[PDB]
Design a protein around this ligand. Structure first.
Ligand SMILES: Cc1cc2nc3c(=O)[nH]c(=O)nc-3n(C[C@H](O)[C@H](O)[C@H](O)COP(=O)(O)OP(=O)(O)OC[C@H]3O[C@@H](n4cnc5c(N)ncnc54)[C@H](O)[C@@H]3O)c2cc1C
Length: 537
């Protein structure tokens, strides 16, 4: 039996729609599947107030850099979610990609059929479609275990499904007269909190531990700036393809320990005040390698927080004590810290007073009862464990992907796993999503996968799977790269350590941290050498 499709692509975010576009442009048959009503992924799902890029719009805008929608005009240096959604909609118009997709459809299971070298893909546990290759673009992030949520009698908002009007704007964003509680001070919370505080009668921020945040420095984009950027796109593209993260930044050549205190302070002050991520990405070369260097920057950011927040007790609570700066994807913010100088804003330390439950009346901590009218659940993400866990994926000998990866992801090139032929995982933490400009990283990744599938078609190969040796060597190489950074000591659970039935010890990181260009170079050496390390038939 032969599959009906060359490929199924799961997800209609930026990654998935471009993979689908590429496959179709190449003359192959592709079906996209998407749970939502339309395209956008992130930019479709996340509708909460303050939702905005951390990457310069022009640098994230790969579909414009690549000449798919080159006329696109950005209105701001760091585009808001509604603009991002318009960009993805326009890109999808230009790629004519919607016709290849099933919308409002969840892939519930995928099983590899060994006799027939194809995937049976189950849609909403009913229809089954067959394809030669299965490609996940289910998103680099996934996603509250609090007693009593269902009992609250006021309004509940969840940042991941913020209610919208018929025009797609967020409902109930005016909190005039309302006592509001926000739980969470990750990326979403720090975008939500300063906006909610503008109208709430009282705002309580329930925070377990603070993250490092830096100011975004967003501003409108002039027509003149937009035109000069567009004229520079061929250069901008070459640049972002050459940096380690694919953001438009590269590390300072110097070690922080080599620079005087006075020079360090001046350098940091300039970068802190420059819009975007430079404070981190343009920082000293040893910032994520060396504790002293890291501490220089963390101390500087801490000093900036103390400047910006009036009450020294409150300030201290907002400054991380227990983790290096940049050990997580750093939230950027617009007047977040100054929000706490407002008289109607209160920080509730729930490490010291954990939440016992949500009640009909509001929130109960170990120490106090907060009567609220509104609760906003500003829930975090896992940028670490990946988005495939909700799909029943079965490879050879009916093995679960979740079991195969129990001791940590095991892949070759971060793209296929032994046991799961003709299955490609785009854009996930195990291949670099966590610290990438995903607009660019993911687009380049989809192009490599296109080239592999085309090669297979040209040669009449219908089977691909990593060897055990190549998968093992890769996975050890990725771990060793990870193990030389401060991430390893700071995020201990990002590493899975397993002593084998005999005595030897296996270590795998959940998160690939290797430089983009080095990673892509290794992928091309493999592709050039007839996909050496993949068995093909
Ligand atoms: C608030 C926020 C701000 C961000 N800002 C930036 C930024 O500035 N720069 C940056 O590089 N990254 C940023 N990110 C990361 C973001 O994940 C990527 O930029 C990008 O949107 C990921 O695109 P994707 O297509 O790979 O996955 P997604 O955009 O997550 O799309 C995945 C799609 O797959 C669908 N799906 C999942 N499972 C199934 C299933 N089983 N069946 C059918 N459909 C399924 C989902 O519905 C979704 O539509 C941000 C993320 C968030 C949440």
């Amino acid at each position: 039996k032969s599959p009906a499709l060359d490929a199924v692509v799961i997800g209609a975010g930026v990654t998935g729609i471009y993979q689908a576009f590429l496959i179709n442009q190449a003359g192959m048959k592709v079906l996209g599947i998407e749970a939502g009503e339309d395209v956008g992924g992130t930019w479709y799902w996340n509708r909460y107030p303050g939702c905005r890029l951390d990457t310069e719009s022009y640098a994230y805008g790969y579909f414009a850099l690549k000449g798919i929608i080159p006329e696109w005009e950005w209105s701001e240096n760091f585009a808001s979610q509604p603009e991002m959604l318009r960009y993805v909609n326009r890109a999808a118009d230009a790629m004519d990609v919607r016709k290849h997709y099933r919308f409002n459809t969840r892939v519930t299971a995928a099983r590899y059929v060994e006799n027939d070298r194809l995937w049976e893909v189950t849609l909403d546990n009913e229809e089954v479609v067959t394809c030669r290759f299965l490609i996940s673009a289910t998103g680099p992030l996934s996603a509250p275990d609090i007693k009593g949520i269902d009992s609250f009698k006021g309004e509940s908002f969840h940042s991941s499904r913020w209610p919208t009007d018929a025009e797609g704007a967020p409902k109930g964003v005016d909190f005039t007269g309302k006592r509001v509680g926000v739980i969470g001070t990750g990326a979403t919370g720090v975008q939500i909190i300063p906006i909610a505080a503008e109208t709430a009668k009282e705002l309580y921020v329930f925070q377990r531990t603070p993250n490092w945040c830096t100011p975004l420095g967003n501003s409108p984009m002039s027509k003149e700036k937009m035109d000069s950027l567009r004229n520079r796109y061929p250069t901008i593209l070459e640049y972002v393809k050459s940096t380690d993260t694919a953001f438009p930044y590269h590390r300072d050549p110097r070690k922080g320990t080599d620079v005087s205190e006075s020079e360090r302070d001046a350098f940091f002050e300039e970068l802190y005040r420059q819009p975007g991520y430079g404070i981190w990405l343009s920082g000293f070369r040893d910032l994520l390698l060396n504790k002293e260097s890291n501490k220089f920057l963390a101390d500087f950011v801490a000093k900036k927080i103390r400047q910006r927040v009036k009450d020294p007790v409150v300030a201290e609570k907002l400054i991380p004590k227990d983790h290096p700066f940049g050990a997580k994807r750093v939230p950027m913010e617009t007047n977040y810290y100054e929000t706490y100088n407002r008289d109607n804003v209160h920080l509730v330390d729930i490490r010291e007073a954990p939440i016992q439950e949500v009640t009909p009346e509001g929130i109960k901590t170990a120490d106090a009862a907060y009567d609220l009218d509104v609760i906003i659940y500003a829930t975090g993400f896992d940028a670490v464990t990946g988005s495939l866990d909700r799909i029943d994926i079965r490879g050879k000998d009916n093995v679960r992907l979740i079991d195969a990866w129990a001791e940590g992801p095991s892949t070759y090139l971060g793209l296929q796993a032994r046991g799961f032929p003709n299955f490609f995982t785009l854009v996930g933490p195990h291949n670099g999503s966590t610290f990438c400009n995903v607009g660019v990283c993911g687009g380049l990744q989809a192009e490599w996968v296109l080239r592999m599938i085309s090669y297979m078609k040209d040669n009449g190969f219908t089977y691909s799977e990593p060897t055990q040796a190549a998968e093992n060597r890769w996975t050890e190489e990725v771990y060793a790269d990870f193990s030389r950074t401060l991430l390893a000591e700071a995020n201990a659970w990002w590493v899975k350590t397993t002593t084998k039935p005999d005595g030897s010890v296996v270590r795998r990181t959940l998160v690939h941290v290797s430089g983009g260009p080095e990673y892509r170079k290794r992928c091309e050496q493999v592709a050039y050498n007839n996909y050496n390390g993949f068995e093909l038939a």
